[model samples]
Each structure stands twice: as structure tokens, then as C-alpha cells.
Target chain A: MDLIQAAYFVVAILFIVGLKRMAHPTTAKSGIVWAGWGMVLAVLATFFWPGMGNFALILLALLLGSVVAWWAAVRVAMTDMPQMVAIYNGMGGGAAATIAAVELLKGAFENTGLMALAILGGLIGSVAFTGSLIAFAKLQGIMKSRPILFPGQKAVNALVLALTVVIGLSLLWNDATASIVLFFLLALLFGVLMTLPIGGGDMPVAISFYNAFTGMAVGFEGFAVGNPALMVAGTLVGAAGTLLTVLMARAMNRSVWISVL
Target chain B: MEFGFWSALYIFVLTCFLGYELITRVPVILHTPLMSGSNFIHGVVVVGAMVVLGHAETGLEKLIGFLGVILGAANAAGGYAVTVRMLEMFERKP
Candidate 1:
């Protein structure tokens, strides 16, 4: 394997080790550091990869992002950590959806399978993005903390979901840019409407579900992009997030599915 | 550089089972921290943003790619930092 691929492989191993370390409280801090180091290594390795360009712009963006994120992390109250997590998690989903959208616009969908993965990525990523944002808003008291349901809300969500699937199929068969754009918009709207009815008490479970969605979306994007690093990391997070969602729900004495219902 | 769907599926399924087993064993008190930790790690998507941005040839692509990188890095940095802070609280004596 080449240097970049080798670096990615090592980074993947670090992620596994980091996750393993997280099983205990005493070891969890070090686990975070290990994962952070893995991230640093992955970024640096990408810098040396063939065809990597735009160093100045990349560095500036990284600097700006890190500064703002660090500031928010330091200042956020512990009680508000879940909201902080919701927003950050939403950012990941937004990044994944944006990447998929860009790739599709670039004509990267050379096959039906690849096109399907891109659409799935875009759909689920957009849903996770908007869904997590609403969860954050609810947790932060920007919206009502109570369950905000209306008559026929479930049916409306079902229709939006059905429309999203139809658009996804159209994009798969026709490869039309309009269909792709519509798919993203409908999925995003579904996310917003679906989460609106969930109460603040269920935000943790909702966030966990969205987190899983983001991971699965990224995993599909990884397949589309042919990157094993993204594929593995995404799957790992997706699986872990799914388990966490169930666990959190049970801890609160509710069924995971029923919490959303 | 075509990736096999079966191989990806295999890895995904195995990881799911392993993750379920490992996470199920974690104490309830640590669930929040565990969730936050996984959230931080998922920010590794920044790698994807970097790769896309590095090779961007158009102004719009660059702008979108830049936003991806910014959002991804913020997710990672904020996640890890907040997770560390929360864990520190748990480790402290009452």
C-alpha cells in the first residue's frame, strides 16, 4: 500500500483502540486523546497524498474551525453538554451531506450502485443534519421542551418520507440534478417535521438516532468515494451510536421505537 | 479503486455486532460520556472534507469544500473537548 493508505490503516486501528479504551471511566480520557491523535495523523497524511492541493485554504479553514469549536467546548456548561453534542453531531451530518451533494454535482456517479449510495448519503445525512439541529434547539430552550404534536403530524411526516423515497428513485434511474436536489430538500424537511413532535426529555434518544443516521450516511458516502477509512470509521460510529440510542432509551424506561412514536 | 459492496457489508455487519457487545457492557453512568466520545470520533469525516477541498477546481466547489472542512473540524474539536470536560467531572471526588 502507499503511504497515505498505510497512514489511514494505522488511524483506523487507533480508532478501535480508542473505542476499546472508552469502556472504563479511568481510560476514557486517554481514549479521546488517542482518537484525536488519529485524526491529526489522518489530516497530515492527506496533506502528503498525491494530488492534494490548496494548502493555504485548507489550513485557514482548519484553523478557523478548531478555534471556534474549542471556544464553544470550553465555555459550554456541563448541563448543556448534550445540546453542544447535538450541534456538533449535526455538523458532521451536514459535512457528509454537502460532500455527497458536491460529488453528485461533479458527475462522480459513474454507476447505478454508486449513484444510489450517493443518494442514500445525501438523504440520510440531510435528515440527520436538520433533525439534530432541532434537537439542539429544543434542548437549548429555543423551542418548546414539550412534545409539540399536531393533528395529522404523523401522516404529514409519512407523506414527506414517501416523497423523499420517490425522488431518490428518480435520481437513481434518471440521474437528474433536479431530482437529487429535491431529494435533499424533502429529506431535510422530513427530519425537521419528525423531530418537532419529540419532547425535550427524549432529545438524547433522538440525538443518538440522528448520530447513527449520520454515521450510516457517511458509510454510504465512503463506499461511493471508494475510501476504506471513511467506510470503516462510519460503520463503527453507526453501530456504536445505534447501541447508545437503545441504551439511553432503556435507561429512561422507554422503548427506543416507542420514544420516537 | 473500486470497493466491493460485499466487503463493505461484511465489515459493517461485523462492526455492528462487535460494537453492540462492547457498548452493552459499559456502565449506565458512563453512557452519556460514551455517546459523546463516539460523536467526537465520527467527526473524522473531516478527512473527507479535506480530500474534497484539496482537489477542488471551481470557486463554488472550493466554497462548499471549505464549509465542509470547517464544519467537520468544529465537530471533532468541540466533541473531544466537551467529552474530556465531562469525563473530568465524573472523575472528580464529591
Candidate 2:
């Protein structure tokens, strides 16, 4: 426990210092590398958790995924970065959601509040998962970047948002399997619909928005499982992305909240 | 170590503040790379995935757990790679 926590504090400092380096282009590259090493320490140190088992499979899974991602990230042309960012960031959301799924499914949460937080994490993660994917599709030209606005786009999205809330609340009290499924289903739908109206012209802001969402999702899940690395790193990114989104949207004279709905 | 709810919340809240302060006045040229860099780092969730998967029981759980780990790992791994590539092209000052 001390080992993990000790490393987590180091990881947190690295991320903060890394992010602070963004003030200059020359420094930021080293910042990424700093955060990268922090990540490596976080991942490696996690195996020391007292409860770990299935070491080989876990290692293989982590190694294979990293190898594939490393390969793809290296090969893709710079022009396709938005698409790459969307998909990769989306996968992290998927990871957070699935972690929530397992914890929820196993009924492992310590209390209703923690369970609710996990559900919230899963809900938001699910949203980021699909939202980022749609962004990827648009950025890659798999789908048009044309805004798909109709008369009631916001109202439609607003209704879906309310529905997910209701189902999520029910999940808090009942923990019914169906409510859980529906909550995620509708959250994913809301994610897609929310991004549907955004054209590529607004893709950068949208990407930052989802990045914040993913970070928050991960942070929420971190609370559920009590992982300090995730809590710090995830929330840190959420703040980073939120600032970027706010700044970017303002540059376009778009209200981040009012314009998105 | 069991991080209590309040303890984690404290960390989360403080980190949020730190994150806000860190990115407040970023250089416009570094915006894309910075976004990419931050995007890459949230892959830290892979640790959460690893913790979940390592404790899996049934095959179904294992499968899903593996998926989580893979997704997290790939997200982190690819993000850094992309950020480095992007940074190389634009780190030059005119």
C-alpha cells in the first residue's frame, strides 16, 4: 500500500510538472516524456497491489495493447491526428466504463454512494466512448463533418440526458441489471447525438470536451476503487481539457454549454 | 492502501485546481500537442484496469477485464507516440 501510494504521489507531481511545461513548446515535449515515465511507474507499481493474480494474462494484455497502440500511433500521418486522438481517448473511456462494469457487476462497492459514483463514472465513460468515436468518424471522413442539426436537437438531447439521469438514479436504489444496461445504452446514445450536430469546424473543442469527460469519468471510477493515481491523473486531465475547451469555445464565440446542447 | 472517500476527494479536488492552473496560459502553438499530450496521459486508467483484471474470476470477467486493460494501455501508449510526433514538427520557434 505504501509502495503504491508513494509512487502515486510521484506520478501526480510528474503530471503536474509535465502539464506546467506546456508554457513553452520546447519544454512540453519533455513534459510528455515526464508524464510518460510517471505512467510507466504507475502501471508497474500496480502489480505490487496485495490482491493481484493472473499476472501473466494481465501482463500480456497490457503489453499487447501498448504494442498495438505504439505501432499505430507511430504509423499514422500527422494529418489524421484528430481521428487518432479521438479513437485513442475514446478507448480510455471504454476502459474506465468496463472497470465500472466489473465493479458494479460483482457488487463490490462499499456503499450506495460509491456504487452511485461508479455508475456515474460508467455513465460518463460510456458517453465519452461513443462521443469520441463519432468524432473520430467525422474527423476521418468515415462520416461527414456536416452538422446534423434539426429543429429540436437540443431538446432531443436534453430529453435523453434526463432519461439517463432517471435510470441512473434508479440504479442507485435498485441495482437492477436492466436499469444498468439501459443507463449505459442511453448514455451512449446521448453521446452520439450530442456530437452529431458538431461539424469538423468545431471538432477540436469537441475533442477537448470529451477529453475532460473521460478524465472526469476516470476520476469518478478512481473514487469507487480508491486508486490515487487515477484520482489525481484523471482529474488533472479533466481540468486541463476543461480549460482548453473553455478557451477554444470562447475563441469561436461559442458558449460551451449553451452551444453544445 | 485504502484511500478513503474523503482522502480521494481531497486529491481529486486539489488536482483539479492544479490542472486548471497549469494549462491556463498555454502557448497557442502548443495547443494541439498539449491537448494530445494530456489526452495521452489519461491512459493511466490502465492501472485501474490491471487491478480489476488481476482479480478476475470467471472467463467472462477475465475477458472484460482484459478488454479494459488493453483499451487503457493502447490509449496511453498511442497518445504519447502521437504527441511526440506532433511536437517534433512544431517545437521550432520562428
Candidate 3:
């Protein structure tokens, strides 16, 4: 009902329109522009938000980030676009996880439900962060393009997975910083292990899967913070990313589960 | 302003379904572009990063918040620029 919410609503609508327009090549360029504008509007609105402060730090960070991003975007080859996407996807997840970490450090998770959401955001975001990085490394040839499986790989992954859930639940109950940190560490390790077994040939699907994970983490963070804009934007990206993951996997004539498994 | 959890979940599920339906219609050739475009959308987390940074009260919080803003912005800018560049190549010469 206020200016910020209204601005976010407009930004969300533009994002939807942008994605819809991406269905065809003829309109995809304009779609990117529209989405870029939406991002601009969203950033500008956040600057004007009443809760916002520290203008100097914020602007400096934005400036530095925009410069690096522009440079990377301009320099990357077309064949390397998937790697670029993977890195950017990792950055998004890392940012979300960082936000959740800052929030937790600030004692923002006051209730069990809120703590759970924060933990989910942190866990999934961390996983996406490391997973996407591994994907990027493989795609960029920094790592072997072949799947690197080891003895008892599945069992080790399963153990880490179970530990993550256990730690996550413990944090919900105790809500301690130590438990939260442990949860993230385990999640990060799980991410590396999960992606290591997949080869470069499935990088597109892996990237999309991690992208969805990042979006879902952000969406959970939105719920934790009770922000409608974050909820809408994150969910939209999560949904779209999931679809892209499935579609890309199908295009390669592989089951989506194989990429994850 | 306090949207219920169920309401948020409802929105999440609906958007997921809608996106699935819409994205399924996109041609195979556009898959790469579509992924890149959605990458730009996920950069919306910049808003979250800004919110955290704007209200940061501690040194560590400020540092983390600053990094979040930087990473989120980079993701958005890089995503959009790269996507546009790739899409341009798909267009035919006049």
C-alpha cells in the first residue's frame, strides 16, 4: 500500500512480463532490458526505503559490483555463457546465505518458525553456492569434465545429508550461533560432494538446479523476514529455474534425476 | 503488511506452476537464453542485501551486508549483460 511495496509490485510485474516475452527469440532481447529495468527500479526503491541507512557504503558496493559484473559480462565468450551463468548463480546463493547469516547474527530469528526458515535459507543457499561453484569449475575446465566418483561416495553424501538435517533441527530448537555455523559447513560440504559426481556434459542442468535452489532459499528468507517482494521475486525465479532445469535435462535426453543423482 | 505463511505458500506454488507451463512452451534453441534471463531475475536478492546493509549496526554485519550487496549486484548486472549479448548473437544479419 506504500511507495516501497507499490514499487516492488511494479518490479515484480515487469519481471513476469520479461520472462513471458522470453518465449521467442524476437522478444527475448527486449525481455532482458525490461528485467534489467525492473532490477533498477527495485534497487532504487530499496534506497528510498525508510529503514535503509548507510548510503555511502551501499552506493560504493553497488558501484564496484556493477563495474565487475559489466566487465565480466563484456569479456566472456559465447561458448562460456553457461559457466558465467553458473558463477552468477553461485553469487546469488552466496549473497542470500550472507544475508541470512547477518540476520541471524543480529538476533533476528526470534521464533522457532522464523529460525527454521532462516536455517533453511542458510542451508540451501550454502549448498547452492558451493554446488554452483563446482559446476562452474567443471564447465570452465578448471576441474575435470568427467564425473569424479569415489568409493562410498553415495554413503558419504548420505551421511552429510543426514547430518545437515540433524544440525538444522538442532538449531531450530537451540537457536545457537554455533549450531547454525555447523549447519552451514555441513551443507557446504554436501554441495561439493553432490556436484562432484556429475560431469560437465550436464552443467546446464546442474546450473539450473542450483539456480532453483538459490531462488528457493531466497524465497524462504523472504518468508523469514516477511517481505512480499522477496517472496514473489524469489518464488518466480525458483519456479522458472526448476522448469529450465527439467527442460534442459530433457533436451539432453537424460533424466533430471541423473543430474542430481 | 503481515502476509500469512499460507498465503505466501499459495503464491509460491501458483507461480511455480505458471512458470512451468510458460517455460515449457519455449523452443529448444532459446533454452540457454531463458536460463540466462531467469538468472537476471534471481538477482532480485540485491534488494535483500540492500535491506540488510541499510540497517546494519555492527562492524561484522556491515561487512557481510556490503559483500551481499556487491555479490547480488554483480549477479544482476552480469546476468543481464551476458544474456543480452547472447541473445544478440541469435539474431540474423540484416
Candidate 4:
């Protein structure tokens, strides 16, 4: 196998081991180190992948994102870990959604499959992006964290859900136009509202959920590009992230729907 | 990535700082329960796996997803419950 694949396999093994080690407080640090190493290796290995064009742009993004991430991690205290994580999660979601949208626009003249993947990715990514941002704001005490139960909170959510579905379905059925932009905008607003009422303590859960959403978008992109490794990796991320989120919810004595406003 | 080297260094330094900080904070009434809650994040892998099962495309995939969900959820629930019970040691319920 190629170095990239081999490196990924090794990284995956370390991920499993890292997760295992995290069970005990004594070993949690080691687990985090291992996971960190895995990330480094995985990212470095990506350099070897073919067709990964525009090294300049990639490098720029990496530099910029790293600086921001480092600042957040350092400036944010342990008590604020959840807030920092939520903010980071939002950035990831937004980036993913934007990339998907760009890809779709580029391929809009043809390639229905690409369009489908792009729309799906864009929709979910935008939601995760906006949702995570609101979560961060709430967790950071910039916004209220209590469950804001208005008379029609559930009804509003339902409307947003219905709207998202309709927009998604119309796009799927070959209805492509600028109006689709409105769909993503609405989804973003819905995400923001959805996460606003969730408390700071639940930031971890929201982060995990957004991570899963980002993974799913990546997997869809992989499928669109016919890359098995991306598909597999993305699937693993999606599954693992979602599971983690649910587990976090249970730990905090909260259910998914209840945790969301 | 251009920032890989620098970020790695940052993480190393920050990890040490966190480690030191956590060590100095004397065990309080809430420490044990908090630790347990954190542990649940690692253990509750099953809940997420089950949700994904609804989206699985194949029988084998579904089966694998189901097993993952179950195992993950059990781990999370067990960790949290055990932690909560442990915290009960410090409690004086009137």
C-alpha cells in the first residue's frame, strides 16, 4: 500500500489505543498525546496524495487556522474548553460547507452526482457551522445558556426542518438556482436558534454532533470523487463523532432533542 | 501544513500547563463526578453508532453499526453511573 494509506492505518490503530487509554485518568494524557500524534501523521501523509493541488492555498489555510487554534487553546482555560471546542467546531463546519458549495457551483453545469453531494454537504456544513458558533457564544457567556422555551419553540424548529427538507428535495430533483442560497441561509439561522438554548455544559455534545456532520460531508465528497480511503475515513469519523456526542449527552443526563432548544 | 511544527509545540506546552493546573486543584466535592462525566464521553460510543444504523446502506454495515452503538452506549452509561455512585460517598442526603 501507499505511504498515505499505511500511515492512515497506523494512525487509526493509535486512535483506537488512544481512546482505550483515555478510560483511566492516569492514562488520559497519554491517550491525548497518542491522538495528537495520529493527527500529525495523518496530516503529513496527506502531502503525498495525488491531485491535492494548490499547495499555496492549503499552506495558507493551515497557517492561519493553526494560529487561531493555538491562540484559542492557550487563551481559553480548562473551564472554557467546551467553548473553545465549540468555536473550533463551527469553523470546521463553515469551511466544509463553503468548500462544498464552491465545488457544486463549479460542477453545476453538469455532473448531477457532484451537485447532489455538494448540496448535501453544504446544507449540513452550514448548519453545523452556525450551530457551533451559537454554542460557543452561549458557552462563553456571551449569550444565555438556559433552555429558552418559547410558546412555539418546537413549532419554529418544525418549520425550519420542513423548509430544509423542501429545499434539499427540490435541489435533489434538479431544481438548481440562486434561490438555493436561501435554503442554506435558513439552515444556518435554524442552527443558530437550535443551539442557543443549550447550556455551556452541553457544548461538548454539540461539538461532537457538528464533528459528525462535518465527517458526513467529507464522506459525501469522497463518494463524489470516487475515493475509497476518503469514504472510509470520513465514515469512521462520522460514526465515531456521533457516538461520542450521544455518549456525552447521556453522561450529562440529557437527551439529544432535550439538549437542543 | 505550514503550522504543523509550531502547533505541535504549542500543544505540548499547553498540555503540560493543563497537567500542572489539574494537579494543583485539590480534589473538591465535584471532582469525582466531573471526572466520571468526562469518562462517559469515551465510553458512550454506542449511542452514536446506533443512530448511524438508520443511515447504513448494507446489512453487514448495519450489523457492525448496531454492535458499535450498543458497546459504545453501554460503556458511556456504565461510566457515568459508576461515577455518580462514587460521588454518593461524599454526599449526605438528608
Candidate 5:
């Protein structure tokens, strides 16, 4: 197998083992460590992979990210870990979406697959990015975390989804950048509207959902770019993250849907 | 092998860092709402995955996306169940 494929295989294995280890509270720490290492390995492997861009920018970003992450970890209280996770998840989605979008812009018209993935990524990313920030604020007591019911909230979201589908399909016939942009903007708005009504107690489900979306986006991007490693790694993260959310919900004896809404 | 070595080292260090912090009780409380919020985000994934699967071009993508939907739904259900239980825990007696 090629280096890229082999790297992806390793990434997938690490993800599965890491997630399984996470099932027990006692092993959860080790699981997290495993996942973190898997991520680093995946990133480094991709850096060395043929199609991937030069590593200078990525390395710089990692350095900066590590510093910021370390500082936050040290300063933040454990009670705030949940909120911190939400904030970081949102940021992850945003980054994934942005990268996918850039890739599409770079190869416009010719890269339909990339464009589609970018749109999906952008939609999910924008929503997660903004919504998670709001969630973090609410959990921090900077805003109300109680369910804010508005008339026709569901209806509005439905309309937004319909619009996104229409515009997304239209991309096949015409390169309407404006339409794509509008589609993502609407999705982002809906994300905010959807999460605003949820109480703080249900934040974990929402954050997990967004994290999954981010993973799906990454997987899609991997497909578009023909990177098996990205696909495997992204899928593993998406699946495992979802599973973790389920376990957390079970721990509290709560049904996830009602908690999310 | 080199990458594996680096990955193992990184994991070791990160584990120590997280483990040390976890041992301190005061910081753990800050982790609660974030965890809950993440659950809610997972709920969104369930809904979004359902939408994505409808238009999936291939059977595999559809299947994978469907799995995503299922996972999300399960999470949402579990979260809600817990919430109800917690609320009940605080119910006032007549």
C-alpha cells in the first residue's frame, strides 16, 4: 500500500481502539490520549503525503494552536470543561468548513465534487461554529441557557433547508457563487435558531452532533481529494464521537432528542 | 515507525496533562455543561445526516450517512431520557 493509504489504515485502527477504550470512565483518559495521538499522526502523515500542501503553514498553526490550547487547559476550571469542549468543537467545524471552501474556490467549475463537499462543510461548519459559541456563552452565564421558544421555529428551519437544497442543486447548472453563499448563511442562521431554544443541560448532544457534522465534512473532503486516510480518519472520528454522545446520554438516563431540542 | 514513536510520545504527554487536571476536583465541575452541550450538538448531527443520506450518490455514502443518523438519534434519545430523570429527581412532593 502507498504511504497515504497505510497512514489512513493506522489512523482508522487508532480511532477504533481509542473509542472502545473510552467506554469505561477509568479508561476514558487513555482513550482520549489515543485519539489525540491518532489525530497528530494523521495530520503528520498527510503533511508528508504527495498531494498535501507544504507543511510550513500547518506546522505554524499547530504551534500556535498548542500554545493556546495549553493555556486554556491550564486556566480553565474542570467545571468549565464541557463548555470548553463545545467552543473547541465549534472552532473545529469552522476550520474544516473554511478549508473545504478554499479548496473549492481554488478549483472552481472543474471540481464539482469538491464544491459539493465544500457546501456541505460550509453549511455544517457555519452552524456549528456560531451555535457552539452561543452555547459556550450560555453555559458561562453570559446569556440565558433556558429554552427560548419562538413561534414557527421549526417551520423556519424547514424553509431554510429547502432553500439550501434548491440552491445546491442549481450549482450543477450554473456557477452561482452567491447562491451557495446564501445557502450557507441560511444554514448558519438556522443553527443559531435551533440551539437557542435548548437549555444548557442538553448542550452535550448538540455539541456532539456538530462534531459529527464536522467529521462528515472532513470525510467528504477526503473523498473529493481522493485521500483514503482522510476518509478513514474522518469516518472513525464521526462514528466514535457519536457513540460517546450516546453513552453520555445513557449515563444521565435521558433520551437524546428531547435533551437536544 | 518514526511517526508512531512521535504519536506514542505525544499521547503519553497529553494523558499526563489531562490526568493531572482531572485529579483536581475544582476543575471537573467546569466540564459539565460543555459535555451536555456537546450532546445537543450531536442531536443536530442526527437530523443533518438524515437529510444528507436522501441525496447520497452512492450506496456506501448513503449507508455511512445513515449510520451517522442512527448514532445521532440514539444520542438524542439518551440525552432526553437523562434530562427527564434529572428533572424528576427535583420534583416537589404534594
Candidate 6:
């Protein structure tokens, strides 16, 4: 485990260097390559984790995911990049949330800050997951992108968020399978409602914001589980997404925090 | 080998500050690509998925982990490829 973690540390630094590579458009592709290498290294090292099992299943999952992503990436046009980003971001959010769910189900963290972090990350991740999907639908023209609203939309969203918070706090105190499922369901609802009101022009900013949410949630899971590589990449994306969202909003001559909330 | 929660928190705080400063230097025209590229990076969550799946003791745990890994892998592959596509256009403007 220690040796595996050492490799993970190396993988983490590679991500940092990769982000540094992104500072220049000329180097951005290589920077991405750097991060991708880190991911490959991290996965490889984990295979060396002592007592690890289910190798074949893990490999199959990775293979299928790579194949599907490759097919979708090859098919998407540059003009459709926004929807592509939405769907991709949603996947990461789902991944982070799943990590949190597994930990919660195992009762692994127990009662501690780590447990709190897991619950929080799961909440955020679930919301970001479903929310990004909605953004994807909007950008893809399957759902209207004209800021769909109904009577008391904010009130409805507010109620859903509050209910999720209540359930999340309850889970933190004592987790059960039933409540856990409902908590995730409510969080997912909040995500959909949260993104439903943003217009087409704001799609980039909304997607960027969810991207930040996904990173923040991922970082929380990383910390909950004590994975440095996960923490570093998660934090980096969280930071970049937050900044990028603000920058994108500024370009649109709108307030991101208040206007969206 | 677990990172201390406090230290990890500190690092997350500091990294956020560092990235905002660095990203401010990224030209606006490249914002789309930057976002896409960063999206690719967060796919690092796949590492978390792997750790979760490898130790899963039951069928459900393994199933969820399997799903997470698939999603993370897709996120990583699609975003990076798309980022590359956008950068190619930037390099060869019409």
C-alpha cells in the first residue's frame, strides 16, 4: 500500500505539471497528455495494491468506458463541444458520487470529519451529476434552453435543496440503505432544478459551474478516503472551474453567484 | 499512506488560490478549450473509482464501482479528445 501510494504521489505531481502545461495554448495538448499519463500511472499502481481483487472486472469496466468515450469524442463536432462537456462533467460527478456512496454503504468513515466529507461530497456530486445532464439536454436541443421556469421555481428548488440537506444531515448521523437512496434522489432533483432556469447563452457558465461542483465533490471524496492523487487533481479542477466560471460570467455581463442562486 | 485531513484541506485551499492566478493568464478565446481540458483532468476520479472497486466485498459494491469507473473513464477520454479537437481549430483558424 505504501509503495502504491508513492506512485500515486508521483501521479499527483504529474497532474500539477500538466496544469502548468495548460498555461499556454501551445502546450495545452501536451499538458493534457501529462495529466492523462498521471491517470494511467495511478490506475496501474493501484493494481499493485495488496489484497486487491476483481482485476478482470475492473479492466473490463475501464475498457468499456474508454471505448464508449472514444466513440463519442470522435463523433462530436467542435460546435457541439458544450453539450459534450456537460455530459462528460456529469459522468465525473457520478463517479465521485459513486465513490462516496460505496464508502457510505460500507460505513467506512464512521463518525468523523471524513464521514462528514463523504456525505457532503456525495450530496454535491449527485447534484452536479443530474444537473450537468440537464445542461447537456439543453445544449443538445432535446430540452428547451430558454430558461424553463414554472410558478415558484425558486421556491421549489429551495425546498428540494433543504430536503436534501435534511436527509444528508440525517445520513451523517446514522446511515441506512433507504435514506441513502432518497438522499441521493433529492440531491439529483436539486441538480435538475438548479440548471433548468439558465438560458442558452449561459450554458457555458452553467456547465463551468457544475464542472467546479464536480471537482469540489471529487476533492471531498479524495480527502474522505485519503487519496493524494485524487485530492490534487480534484482540487486543481475545482479551482480552475470556479475561476473559469467567473471569467465566463464576466464576459456575459452577468452576476454568477446571485443571479444563478 | 492516507493523507491527513487537515493537511489535505490546506492543500486544497492553497491550490485553489494558485490555479485562479494561473488561469487568469489563459486568453479568453481559449476559455472553451481550457474548460474542456480541465474537465478531462477531473476524470482523475477514476482513480478513486478503482480503489473503491478493487476492495468491494459484495456484488452491489462492485457494480457501483464498475459504473463509476466506466463514467470516469468516459469523462477522461471524451473531454481530452474534445479539448484536442478545439485546440486543433485554434491552431488552424479559418
How displaced is residue A243 in candidate 5, in Å? 4.2
lDDT at residue A63 of model 6 (Cα atoms): 91
**Chain A only, candidate 1, TM-score:** 0.96
The predictions' CA RMSDs to the true structure, in order, are 1.7, 1.9, 1.5, 14.3, 13.1, 1.7
**Segments in model 1 whose C-alpha atoms lie over 4 Å from true places:** B1-6
Put the candidates in DockQ order, highest first.
2, 3, 6, 1, 5, 4
Output the TM-score of candidate 3: 0.96
| lDDT by residue for model 1 (A37-138), tens | 887887788777568799898999899988999898999778899999899989989889888988877877778888888788889889999999999999
Every candidate's lDDT:
0.84, 0.86, 0.85, 0.52, 0.52, 0.85
Clashing residue pairs, candidate 3?
A: none
Question: Looking at candidate 4, what is the lDDT of residue A198?
Answer: 65
Model 5 regions more than 4 Å off: A51-55, A108-115, A243-254, B1-94
Q: Cα lDDT for residue A122, model 3?
A: 86
Which lDDT tens digits does candidate 5 get at residues A1-261? Answer: 377558656765665565444444445445544544554565556444433332343344444544554455446655565566666666555554444444443343365655676566667667777787777788988888887888887787678778767776676566555765666677677678768877877876677666666655555554454444444444444554555456556666787677665
Write one digit per residue (lDDT tens) for candidate 2, span A51-90: 7898998989989999999999888788898789899999
Q: lDDT of model 5 at residue A131?
A: 82
- In candidate 5 chain B, where is summed lDDT lowest over 10 consecutive residues? B80-89
List the candidate 2 regions with Cα displacement exceeding 4 Å. B90-94
Top DockQ model = 2
lDDT string, candidate 4, B16-90, tens digits: 343223323323333333333333333222212322333344554444444433333332333333433443444
lDDT of 6 by residue, A1-261 (tens): 678878988887887888778768678767877877887888788777666788998899989997888798888767898899899999999999999999988989754788888999999999889999999999898998898878999899999999999989998666899989999999998998899888888788889999999999988888889888778788888888898899888887887974477
TM-score of 1: 0.95
Listed models, DockQ each: 0.71, 0.78, 0.76, 0.03, 0.04, 0.73
Q: What lDDT is reached at residue B30 by model 4?
A: 33
Q: Candidate 3, residues A1-261: lDDT per residue as tens digits? A: 488888988998888889888877778878888888888898988887666789999999999987998898898778889899888889889888988888887778667787788778888899999998999899887998899989999999999999999988886567677876787789999989999999878778888899889988888888888776678778888888888888889889998897798
Docking class of 4: incorrect
Q: What is model 5's native contact fraction? A: 0.01
Pick out the ten consecutive residues of candidate 6 chain B with the lowest summed lDDT.
B85-94
